Design a protein around this nucleic acid. Sequence first.
DNA 1: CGACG
DNA 2: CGTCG
Lengths: 469, 223
Amino acid sequence: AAVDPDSGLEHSAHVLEKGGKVFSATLGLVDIVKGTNSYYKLQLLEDDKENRYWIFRSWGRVGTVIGSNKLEQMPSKEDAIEHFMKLYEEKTGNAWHSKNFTKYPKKFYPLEIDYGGTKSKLPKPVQDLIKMIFDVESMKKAMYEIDLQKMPLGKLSKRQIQAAYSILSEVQQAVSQGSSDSQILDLSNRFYTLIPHDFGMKKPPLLNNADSVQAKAEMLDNLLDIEVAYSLLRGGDPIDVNYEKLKTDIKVVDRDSEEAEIIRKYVKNTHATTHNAYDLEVIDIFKIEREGECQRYKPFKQLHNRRLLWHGSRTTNFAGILSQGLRIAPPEAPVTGYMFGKGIYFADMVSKSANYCHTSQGDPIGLILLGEVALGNMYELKHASHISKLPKGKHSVKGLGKTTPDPSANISLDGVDVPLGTGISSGVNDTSLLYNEYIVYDIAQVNLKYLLKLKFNFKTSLWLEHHHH
Amino acid sequence: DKLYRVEYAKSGRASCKKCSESIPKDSLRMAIMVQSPMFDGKVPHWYHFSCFWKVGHSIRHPDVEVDGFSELRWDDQQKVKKTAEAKSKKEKDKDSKLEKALKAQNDLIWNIKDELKKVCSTNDLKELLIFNKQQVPSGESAILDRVADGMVFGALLPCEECSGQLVFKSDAYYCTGDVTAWTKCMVKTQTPNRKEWVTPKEFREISYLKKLKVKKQDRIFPP
DNA sequence: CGACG
DNA sequence: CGTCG
Ligand SMILES: Nc1ncnc2c1ncn2[C@@H]1O[C@H](C(=O)N2CCN(CC(=O)Nc3cccc4c3CNC4=O)CC2)[C@@H](O)[C@H]1O
Ligand SMILES: [Zn+2]
Ligand SMILES: [Zn+2]
């Protein structure tokens, strides 16, 4: 682990690792009513060279200068270990090596800080695609980059993030059924203990604003899927190794191919600059076939109203996606903002789905899938409704929006409807959605067919110079 | 909670933040609660009752602005209230009557407290609290205060939610229990449920040193 | 939070 | 412990 720099021994000494234990505790303590949001760091340091041992304490209020520290050099490592363990006991009420930890009132809670041939035959576009979806650089950066506003006490392990996620789901369940305020306060204290925040010196707020808790759940879901993608990158020409890991077959559609021209028209007509400060440019087209996905999709192949629809996610996930097909969220995850419960979402307009790539001006490249989804009988809704059961005779859901592709321009590719028409007004009244949202609830109702690489040409100084002369 | 505090020195060890001299024990002292730079908590800067009003601290209404005011002795309350500054008449007679009752209750509690201090020891008071199903708090001052409370009004029954121990603050009774290991109880009430105080027979020789006089008094709170 | 009677 | 910073 890391030596706390406040001690001034990071280059002179390291942190001790005896047996199956590391001597660096980072404890938090939160009380919303009284307003306390305290941190306590404890470390046992060993000099890299000689046999000299230190105990370092650092207490205070998170994300502020309030606090202090102390450093005691000890006569021996035995006395140092005794001191460390007894201090941990005094501050948390539990022993150092205790499988089952139990929170005690007015005591700190321990946080789980995360510390630390060349005969590639494949075509160049596919090699670049693989380099894109397996970029350890970007993932390691986004993961272990030191942010003190979102992580005032350091990176949190996947365990603790999942714990806060489940606590947020419990909060939503409590807010749904008018539960006691005591329930909500207990959950809030637990959450803010597990997920330290830099509130300066203001009292932490209760988890009563469902919008803010949806935001926090989205943040935690982002962190969790990042952790999953990184766990995927480490498995064991390297490009061909990762290609094998995908468990999918990829082919580069020819530029002057006619299905490629159909795909390009689809991207062109259905991109609305009304809520997208950028234009889409197609770089590469890819035809994809997943391991045995056609098998699980056969039951719906002859189903009616099959449609080729968009799905956009962050590139970090795409690896995962291609190796497991689109997956539904678990039943214990809180809602992040989606309007029609837990399922596989798609859009008919590339704008809507592309905005889910979260591509920035620094990395204007984003990935996006085309899937033949077997929609069958639609359940057409205008307002949110967390559907757990589809009405009898229905195979999918469709949230109707104010703008839709022109239905008179539908195309039939492989017997599949493609809504590549231009944007028009739908005629639906009293609708909260702007663009349609198709939704299925059986992972087998979707058959991924094409994968696109898109440049998000943002309308900045460069675009303005290129567009005005 | 409050910005100001007043009490009798629980020890002759605190130094005045103005004259930098030791505040003697049991002496009326006033503190201003400020943020500590050393840890995440509020700390009182203490002052002699004399040196306090020399730092230009304008206190309009001590009983409400200052914590622990209602617990002081009556004459010291009057002193703090005065120094802080430097159909209506029937209701005024009524107000005078209520003030007389309040003085009665205050000096009664204090007489009981110092009588117990004269006869009983600290462990005797702890035992008196135990026998009445009361929690033994930290600080012999609080021990004596709670023994007096119990003897006057009655042994406080446990809380109904957390099953903790209720304690009297300047305002009303607050629960000090823990609904869970993460949050404390916050039950507040001025009418706590209680059974009659029962002095163990051991202290009967000293309970006649209380001359009974239990009275049927009820805790009077400020408006 | 740690320090001291 | 109980008080104090
Ligand atoms: N195997 C896998 N490995 C990694 N990530 C995987 C995966 N399978 C699914 N995912 C990814 O997890 C994410 C997920 O579950 N989510 C995201 C949150 N929620 C809302 C949602 O559907 N958003 C949403 C809403 C409306 C339209 C569109 C989308 C996304 N694309 C669209 O066209 C649906 C559940 C999602 O981004 C998906 O692509
Ligand atoms: Zn003084
Ligand atoms: Zn209670």
